[PDB]
A paper describes a structure:
Different AAF variants are expressed by different EAEC strains, where they are required for the bacterium's adherence to small and large intestinal mucosa. As with Afa/Dr polyadhesins, AAF consist of two secreted protein subunits, a major subunit (A) and a putative minor subunit (B). In the fiber, subunits are linked together by donor strand complementation (DSC) with an N-terminal Gd donor strand segment of one subunit inserted into the hydrophobic cleft of a neighboring subunit. In this study, we report X-ray crystallographic and NMR studies of monomeric, donor-strand-complemented major and minor subunits of AAF/I from the German outbreak strain and AAF/II from EAEC strain 042 and provide an atomic resolution model for the structure of the entire fimbriae.
In EAEC, the minor subunit of AAF/II (AafB) has been associated with the release of cytokines, suggesting its surface localization and function in EAEC pathogenesis. At the same time, based on the fact that minor subunits of AAF are 12–23 residues shorter than major subunits, we hypothesized that they do not possess their own donor strand sequences and are stabilized in the fiber by strands donated by major subunits. The minor subunits AggBdsA and AafBdsA have more similar structures than the major pilins: 117 matching Cα atoms are superimposed with r.m.s.d. of 1.2 Å. The donor sequences derived from the corresponding major subunits form classical donor strands (Gd), each inserting five donor residues into the subunit core structure. The values of shape correlation statistic (Sc) calculated for the acceptor cleft-donor strand interactions for AggBdsA and AafBdsA (0.733 and 0.756, respectively) were similar to those calculated for AggAdsA and AafAdsA (0.784 and 0.804, respectively). The good geometrical fit between the donor strands and acceptor clefts suggests that these interactions are native. As predicted, the minor subunits have no N-terminal extension that could act as a donor strand: the first residue in the mature protein is structured and immediately followed by the first strand A. Hence, this structural evidence suggests that the minor subunits assemble by accepting donor sequences of the corresponding major subunits. As such sequences are only available in tip subunits of major subunit polymers, the AAF minor subunits are likely to be tip localized. In minor subunits, strand A is not split between the β sheets, but locates entirely in the sheet 1. Instead, strand C2 that in a classical Ig fold is hydrogen bonded to strand F, in minor subunits is hydrogen bonded to strand D and hence belongs to sheet 2.
Residue numbers in the entry: 0 to 9, 11 to 76, 82 to 120, 130 to 143
Write the structure that this text describes.
């Protein structure tokens, strides 16, 4: 009914630029729907849906400022896109220029199909070398 996948770039450098795609995913809905919901399981930037701070896997102090969205997403805690089509593509991007501490960053994203729904989660890891 509802399947979600997320795929990293798979050899990051330390210097990131605004908009740099760090990961890509899709949501598939096979039952009738009017749209898609997507959210990242990460701390959100204050009052700004779609924008997140991802922490390091072993470092705590290592942070990555990142945003969701590709085409037509919007603020309704989570962001939303309309469509009856079977699937959407979405991107996780570097939010402004930044210098990432080396290490590992786990992106974790959950999605719903829009008709009280059940969300599936997908995760991808990036390594800043």
């Amino acid at each position: 009914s509802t399947e979600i996948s997320l795929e990293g770039l798979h050899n990051m450098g330390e210097q990131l630029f605004d908009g740099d795609i760090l990961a890509t995913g899709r949501i598939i809905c096979r039952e009738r729907h009017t749209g898609f919901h997507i959210q990242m399981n990460a701390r959100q930037v204050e009052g700004r849906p779609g924008h997140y701070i991802v922490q390091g896997s072993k470092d705590t102090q290592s942070k990555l400022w990142v945003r969701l969205g590709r085409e037509g997403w919007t603020s309704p805690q989570g962001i939303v896109r309309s469509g009856q089509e079977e699937q959407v593509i979405f991107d996780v991007m570097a939010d402004g220029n930044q210098w990432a501490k080396p290490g590992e960053y786990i992106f974790s994203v959950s999605g719903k199909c829009l008709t009280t729904a059940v969300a599936k989660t997908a995760t991808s890891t990036i390594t800043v070398v």
